[PDB]
Write a protein that binds this DNA or RNA. Sequence first.
DNA 1: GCAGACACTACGAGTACATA
Lengths: 546, 174, 261, 261, 325, 348
Amino acid sequence: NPVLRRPPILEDYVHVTSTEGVRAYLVLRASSHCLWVDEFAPRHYTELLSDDFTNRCLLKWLKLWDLVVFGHERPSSHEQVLEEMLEAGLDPSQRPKQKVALLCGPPGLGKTTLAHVIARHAGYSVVEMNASDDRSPEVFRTRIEAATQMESVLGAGGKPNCLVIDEIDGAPVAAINVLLSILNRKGLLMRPIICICNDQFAPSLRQLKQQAFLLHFPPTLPSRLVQRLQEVSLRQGMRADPGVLAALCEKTDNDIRACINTLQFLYSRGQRELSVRDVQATRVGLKDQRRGLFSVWQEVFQLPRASLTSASQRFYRVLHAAASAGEHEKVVQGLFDNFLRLRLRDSSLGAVCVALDWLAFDDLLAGAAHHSQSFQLLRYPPFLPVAFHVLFASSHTPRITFPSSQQEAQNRMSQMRNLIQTLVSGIAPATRSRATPQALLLDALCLLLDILAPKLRPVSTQLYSTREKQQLASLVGTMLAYSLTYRQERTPDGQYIYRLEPNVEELCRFPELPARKPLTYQTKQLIAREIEVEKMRRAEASARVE
Amino acid sequence: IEPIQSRCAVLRYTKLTDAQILTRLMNVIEKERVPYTDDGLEAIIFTAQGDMRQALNNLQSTFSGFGFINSENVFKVCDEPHPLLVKEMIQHCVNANIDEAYKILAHLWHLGYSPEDIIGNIFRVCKTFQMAEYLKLEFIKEIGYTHMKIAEGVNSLLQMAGLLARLCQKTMAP
Amino acid sequence: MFEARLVQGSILKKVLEALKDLINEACWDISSSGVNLQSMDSSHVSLVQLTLRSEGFDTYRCDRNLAMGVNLTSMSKILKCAGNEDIITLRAEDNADTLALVFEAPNQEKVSDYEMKLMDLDVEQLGIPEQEYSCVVKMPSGEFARICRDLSHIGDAVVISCAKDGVKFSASGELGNGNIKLSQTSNVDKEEEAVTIEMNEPVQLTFALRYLNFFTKATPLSSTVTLSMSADVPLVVEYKIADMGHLKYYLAPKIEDEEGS
Amino acid sequence: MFEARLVQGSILKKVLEALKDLINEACWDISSSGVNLQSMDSSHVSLVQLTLRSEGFDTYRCDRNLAMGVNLTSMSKILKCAGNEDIITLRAEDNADTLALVFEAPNQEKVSDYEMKLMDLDVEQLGIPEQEYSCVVKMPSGEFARICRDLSHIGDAVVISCAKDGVKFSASGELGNGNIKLSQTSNVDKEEEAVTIEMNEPVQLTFALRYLNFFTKATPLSSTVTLSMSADVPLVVEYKIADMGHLKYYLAPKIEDEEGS
Amino acid sequence: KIRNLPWVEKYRPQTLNDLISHQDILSTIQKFINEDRLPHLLLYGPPGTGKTSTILACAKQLYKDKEFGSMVLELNASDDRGIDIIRGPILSFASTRTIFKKGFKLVILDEADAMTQDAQNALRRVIEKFTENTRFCLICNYLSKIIPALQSRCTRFRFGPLTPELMVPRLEHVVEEEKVDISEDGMKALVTLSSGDMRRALNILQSTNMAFGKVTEETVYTCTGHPLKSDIANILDWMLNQDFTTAYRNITELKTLKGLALHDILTEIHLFVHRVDFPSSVRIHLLTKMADIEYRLSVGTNEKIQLSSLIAAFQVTRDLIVAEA
Amino acid sequence: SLWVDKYRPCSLGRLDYHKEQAAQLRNLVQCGDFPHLLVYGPSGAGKKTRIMCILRELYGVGVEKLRIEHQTITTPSKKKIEISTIASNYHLEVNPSDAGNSDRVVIQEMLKTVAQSQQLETNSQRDFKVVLLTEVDKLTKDAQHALRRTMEKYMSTCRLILCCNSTSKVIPPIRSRCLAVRVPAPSIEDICHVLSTVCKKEGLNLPSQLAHRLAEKSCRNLRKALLMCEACRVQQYPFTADQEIPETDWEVYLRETANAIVSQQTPQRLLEVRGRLYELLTHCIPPEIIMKGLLSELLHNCDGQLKGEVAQMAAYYEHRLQLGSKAIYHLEAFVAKFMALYKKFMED
DNA sequence: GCAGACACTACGAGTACATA
Ligand SMILES: Nc1ncnc2c1ncn2[C@@H]1O[C@H](COP(=O)(O)OP(=O)(O)OP(O)(O)=S)[C@@H](O)[C@H]1O
Ligand SMILES: Nc1ncnc2c1ncn2[C@@H]1O[C@H](COP(=O)(O)OP(=O)(O)OP(O)(O)=S)[C@@H](O)[C@H]1O
Ligand SMILES: Nc1ncnc2c1ncn2[C@@H]1O[C@H](COP(=O)(O)OP(=O)(O)O)[C@@H](O)[C@H]1O
Ligand SMILES: [Mg+2]
Ligand SMILES: [Mg+2]
């Protein structure tokens, strides 16, 4: 016991006394020349490893250019929109209405191979423009003008040019604007252009997706890739079971190039038979995959289906997937916008409270790191998603939506601040200093709108009384003081409406409030006409005084 | 990026073990005629932490400074690793044993380690520690809360002791 | 009705560039004598006066004492679209709320009309005392611009001294002092190069550099420049712009240090 | 009291434009013999030894010996606004910080007194060996500047060799190699364009092109340059100014390792 | 001759024999110099332990005064050390040989934790490639701000805090060189308030000798403003022995009379509570409350309310300690 | 012109309340060596009116002739920011919080240029210029730490009248450098007297019952009381003692938000309340006022042994909101904590 | 001898990010 009733004999002691006065004492003291990915590359349409629907759609889209390019009438869900646009017809310029084919997908699927094989199969000559070029908006422009606006220098019998633009997701936005301006010259584009990217949701390609024949590559079928790897290994004289090749295809996430490179390293010539433990080992063939946002939200919110059943492995897997995805703010926004839509089992709201505590912890860490320039604090918010995985992991199938609430709120707040500035700048500086815009918004806006809307009968000015004339004069005076007026606005229904010039009703009114009676069209037109008349009379009085 | 990793064979090297570094150290010792004991070579392996550069640097430093490789001559110039000693303090904080945790903290404080290095080692141990996951998240949140105060400017022994006391509080607060 | 015509379009194209970054608006006072502009800056340091008499215009119509207030952020963009040697007519109605500038296009094939909204500003005349200055000197305009530009690479503020010897510019900074003097330049062929002294009492005052550079942005309007100073009166920089009128600049000094004992 | 007087301003402008991107700060060592300046570069790779004689100045007085460390960007800004035909006075007191540069405007009317503040660098004196070199080459400075500019387009490090035949330049770059070898060009009407070989033992050394291109900016100072090379002592570029003094540039060779094979 | 210098700059250990504490490290570095086997060094430790003095003594021992400007490239946090500097002057200094005499060169990077990680990643092959031509010495206070690739390439020496037993003779040398009358309690107060830092020891010695003319315990604790051990013992006894009002009055009178600050009182009370044999639940509460009070003092907060909370943190635990029995 | 601006007093002798403070402020600024002022009090108490009365006392009647001046300031990131300024020929009025976190760039560069320069006309203008920094409690601490040496060095030729609502957000170095002038809110009798005087100057008759109800509903805000009285005449000129007084929309929306919090305690109700809180944050309502209105309406539904815990939670999450940057996290955390506490109290 | 054209570097400007 640390507390002794008797005082110590040898060691020094510290007294402790209670409120009731009881004393205690404590102690103070060319087979060998080329790669296998180039030796086994497809040289024909029948050797492709992509999805057959995407190959047929790209071939049909390129054969839709046969009338304009080759001068011949005869060439010889996600699926439904493509099959409709392939059968949608042609514009009166004898061209497809989708003149650009945008190719998207994860790396190593065969997009460049599909583009080159489909272009050389349809009688074109492949002109490539990839990320290793200068990609400035003038060099991009003159290269597209070279590739698409001229015929062949071989004369008759020369193949047409199919411009393949590889890695368009890394191009700047001005290059995409140059490409779209060339695409929309009405200078007419007479040759097909096919673009290849890896991430379709790039901010530079957002205008391109609305104008392109969007082909999204699914991951390759494991049975087809297993058969192709069996063909490659049997051509190279190496024996492997289909199970170890299926495990290798699982390891590389259906990447053809990574699997063939891993086989080329692992085979060599010391041994013939592949072993399962070589594929299962992380030394050869394991590369970092950048996870998608929806896959990360799905693996956070949903438990894996039934080793891997331990909670620590799920903890580390969720942490590493959320770290490897990147775009941390979007992950946090998706967690914030999706965690209350689940079938939550915590009816006492404790998990929601500690999740909001973790969100406030991330926000405080971001603020402290951006204030003190101490970014070693930025290693803790990567543990924000995995905390959600400890809180809201369920065996159900949650419908994860893309986060929009924070961005919509920020944009609407920016619009409200711009509207506040527009309202404030119209008033006179003699009365602008008497109230701050915050106090004007909180105190002097809804009451001001109640002042600006009296109960006025639809009666002309000659039949009005003296009191009603004085009330209308005070109304137009306080309307002119804040530089407000009513102006006509057209509607799709065909009826003219009258709206306040600085439309401050969206600043004042709230959606779920009880409704109030507005002014009619006649009295608002009378108010606007009296505002114009009083402005002209004020100008005349100022001219008479001066 | 993933296109470059798809375009290449991705070989991953693991951290070197004790016998693998010991073979190269025996080769260098037989080349350089360095007298040694087994305990001194074990101390060189201990200070190496899987790094051959640090093993060769520590062997060169000990042989130049003293001319003999035993445990005392290695530990006079080299240093014991940090996270193995931090892990014992984290284990004491898991069992809410504040006295031994403060003993390890004060030993690390009197060795001249700054609060930022100590809290970095504490976070790196608590990332891979073997405990409950919710308790691990509570520990990581408390570590980040203390590290914000360290980055603000208040970095004393009392602040690290308060961090240790809060980590011991997190154990006895279900 | 305000209706004025210019004889040269380069007067506005040299006088609005000095007021581009100096003052935020141009307030013109209309009278029978001419147009008067008195504008104080937002920091209450600089004061710009511009008096262009009615005898210098090609034509001038003024019935009532009116005041117009125009902005600079639109007039500066409008002036760059105008030509150089063309004619500029300014028009303003009695009751309208816009000012019209009519000139010729730089292609010299069409007439360009530009309208600007009249900002209703509520100002009052500060009132210069027009007192006897303790130092009056005359200097070349471009030489004064080169002098104010050469002290920009040294210090953020300049020191103007004026004894009977001449006018001394100083620039003390972290690099080192830059001192230049001009004295007795009557033995030159050009009459605009005459650096002369006119008063007796010496004055030493520290002024800003940015406002003096903005003052020397209006140098090819006139041939000579005049500098007036006193012990507490702000610095007066006078340009006699051709025949239509003149321009005055007032720059307040800086707060002196506590060098007493 | 220190008071030197550069007879024309062009030589100081050429000196301070040669050293502008090379020398961190100027250490003027002042004696009765003249003005000495031994300063290394910021990378501690090159060395500049400038010696101006007392007879080259207009008037030169020096009572006690000085060592003035001054900044170079400030002196570059001072000498930028200086003429090429006007006298420039360098003044310094016994225990002051003001190093005064007194000159005239390009308008040749007003004086200009630019002060600089002296630094305290107390750097130790670097010993020039002044030993004999195994290769001495007289060549024109413009040809040396042209060949350094031509070798800068191919590579970044240039192997310069010298033997009984002549000086040889090689630049093994990424495009390829450029090997330029010039000898016995004394058979022209000019006297500056000549290649002369004085010493015996061949040397091959590699140097950075950036420092050589910085050294070639002293071309308007001297029409003929001297190259001194040996296997141990560095590369010396010696410009002999006509009636003022001389300028020595010392550049250390790069570390080159042969292939193990 | 005499100069107007601070005593942390007037008395700098120009040779390696004048540094006091890290004898094994200094012997190893001296044998590195004598055998001409100097590696890339990484000197890390708390401030005021003698890392910059060590590398400057080594640079003065390795090179003469006639050649020191061509062999040593010293860069610190007051200089620009961006990636253009690593690819520029540092790489050209590493890749070229000397000017006057043959020898290996020395690049000193003082305060290397302030370098950006791009510059630290560019430093790696400069250090590895030109090892025979030039040597690198990194000096830092925080080892975590240096990348592990640079920590692999350098042999690291921990310059730990100066023990007060070895700290005494250097202070006695400074005292005898300045004609300072000091008592034994004054030297004990110097080595106590310094806490492994010779800079603050010499600064407190110079400040006390200028303020009072003598260096005793009273003069040191008055010039520093630090509370004495008896004052902290009285404060702890008042907090643990009597009620809130009497302890508040006594501590307020002691703080007003001697002009004490709450930060040093918190530091010494925190040092005291680990010595007093408290129960573990009491100690955790005391440490948490004192860390909260010390965090509250870092902003514009009234010190009287925080002193009342410091009294409150022990008045809570008084009954608990006594009823534990 | 509204009643808030039509009948505002011009001089210190025309104020209807705090007349002893008005005489003391007249005595303070008479000599001209008065220090920097920090006018603080609740909103609508009459701080700006007394500041303009002090300005009219110091200078002539030309203080009321105002103008708008726009100044473009360059940030250290070289992003140009335009800031408006109420100006006269004698004083300046800056609200630096309009530049947000760049407010320090307003203090370090735009203010010092005002302070370092003397007056052009020392006969019309006095020996000092006055700068009114509006809403200094909304300033960041960096701007307040940039303020202090400008206040100390140029006090003899540049005076400052800072204005705020709470002096707790002002750092102690700034509060040490200025004299703190407290303007309390007018009482119910003072607001009734002001409203009666305004109605009799307008030719109208105001009952004591309606004036007392306007003063009680205004929460001692004279601006809101005058606006409510003008809205009441507008909507019904014969002043009944039980005439319905109009109310602001965001207050009713906040009351219905708190009623929605009380009505259900479920994550779906938390989602709907989070939508209501974004609607409130979108309309530029400050989150501290959202917290205060939420507390003021949630305490009307709690029992006697829960209100202290609800108030402590509201203060805690308001403090965490001030320490953070995203207000919706702390607002929803307070609502979720209240829902958990209210469910625990109702079930047990 | 002086106007037109060539490439040269210095400088303004936009954007990303900062951890394990
Ligand atoms: N059917 C196939 N059989 C074997 N190898 C193939 C087959 N199809 C394609 N490949 C190879 O696998 C790789 C496919 O990748 P590519 O089409 O060149 O590039 P990509 O598919 O666009 O992916 P990224 O984003 O550019 S990395 C290439 O190395 C091809 O040679
Ligand atoms: N070991 C020591 N022996 C003697 N004097 C010392 C010692 N350490 C420090 N000093 C004194 O303290 C002064 C500064 O020490 P430094 O060498 O700068 O220590 P430091 O390790 O570099 O501290 P930092 O980390 O750079 S702030 C020296 O000039 C000496 O006067
Ligand atoms: N003494 C007074 N007599 C009559 N009305 C007043 C008086 N003081 C203030 N008011 C009115 O009350 C309102 C208070 O607003 P303001 O003066 O801006 O104070 P605050 O700055 O505290 O909001 C003003 O609109 C003003 O017209
Ligand atoms: Mg590709
Ligand atoms: Mg140091």
